[PDB]
Design a protein around this ligand. Structure first.
Ligand SMILES: C[n+]1cn([C@@H]2O[C@H](COP(=O)(O)OP(=O)(O)OP(=O)(O)O)[C@@H](O)[C@H]2O)c2nc(N)[nH]c(=O)c21
Length: 177
C-alpha cells in the first residue's frame, strides 16, 4: 500500500447538553495509507447527511481536536462559512477538498503548522475550518490561508478570516485572505 506522510485520526462529535463538551468527542478511526483513507471515506456517512449539532474532525495522530491540546492552545483557525441552502451543493465538495489538502501535504514548507480540520453542521449554517498551531506565525498562517482559499476555488473577492482560539473562547479576525 501507499503510505501518507502523516498518520491521521477521524473524530466525531455529537451535541448532548447533559454531557460536558469534551465528553461528547469520540475517536472513530486512524489511517496512514492512501488505500485506508479511501476505505474510510467510501464507507462512512457524508457530512451533508449528519444531524444538526454534530461535527467531524481530522487531526494528525496525537493531537486531540480541542483548544486545550498543547498544539492548539496557542493556535487558531481559517474559517469558511456556508449557508444552510448550500448543504447539498457545496458542503461535501468543500470537506473532501479540505481533507485532500491535509493528507496530501499541500502546505509544503509550513506543513508542521497544520493541526487538522473541522466541519460543523448546524441549523443556522455550516462551517469548515483548518486549525493551525501558532496564531503568531504570520508567514505560516498567511501561506496556509492563501493556498486553502485558492484550492476551494472561492471567488478571489470573498475574503475569509483567521481567528485565534483564545479570542473564540472569550466571545475578531487576526488575518484575512
Ligand atoms: C471547539 N470547541 C467548542 N467548544 C464549546 O462548544 C461551544 C460551541 O461552539 P462550536 O464550535 O461547536 O460552534 P457553534 O456554531 O455551535 O457555536 P457558536 O459559535 O458558539 O455560536 C463553544 O462555545 C464551547 O462552549 C469547546 N469547548 C471546549 N472546552 N474545547 C473546545 O475545543 C471547544
Amino acid at each position: 500500500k501507499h503510505p501518507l506522510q502523516n498518520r491521521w485520526a477521524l473524530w466525531f462529535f455529537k451535541n448532548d447538553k447533559s454531557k460536558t463538551w469534551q465528553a461528547n468527542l469520540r475517536l472513530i478511526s486512524k489511517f496512514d495509507t492512501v488505500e485506508d483513507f479511501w476505505a474510510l471515506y467510501n464507507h462512512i456517512q457524508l457530512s451533508s447527511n449528519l444531524m444538526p449539532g454534530c461535527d467531524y474532525s481530522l487531526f494528525k495522530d496525537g493531537i486531540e481536536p480541542m483548544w486545550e491540546d498543547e498544539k492548539n492552545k496557542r493556535g487558531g483557525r481559517w474559517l469558511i462559512t456556508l449557508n444552510k441552502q448550500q448543504r447539498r451543493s457545496d458542503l461535501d465538495r468543500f470537506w473532501l477538498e479540505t481533507l485532500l489538502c491535509l493528507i496530501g501535504e499541500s502546505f509544503d514548507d509550513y506543513s508542521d503548522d497544520v493541526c487538522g480540520a473541522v466541519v460543523n453542521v448546524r441549523a443556522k449554517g455550516d462551517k469548515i475550518a483548518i486549525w493551525t498551531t501558532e496564531c503568531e506565525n504570520r508567514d505560516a498562517v498567511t501561506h496556509i490561508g492563501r493556498v486553502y482559499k485558492e484550492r476551494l476555488g472561492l471567488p478571489p473577492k470573498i475574503v475569509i478570516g483567521y481567528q485565534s482560539h483564545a479570542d473564540t473562547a472569550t466571545k475578531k479576525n487576526r488575518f484575512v485572505v
